């Protein structure tokens, strides 16, 4: 799934 995953 997500993480620090920023746009």
């Amino acid at each position: 799934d997500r993480v620090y995953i920023h746009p």
Side-chain angles (χ1 to χ4, degrees):
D1 212 52
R2 289 297 158 283
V3 189
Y4 120 83
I5 68 323
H6 275 327

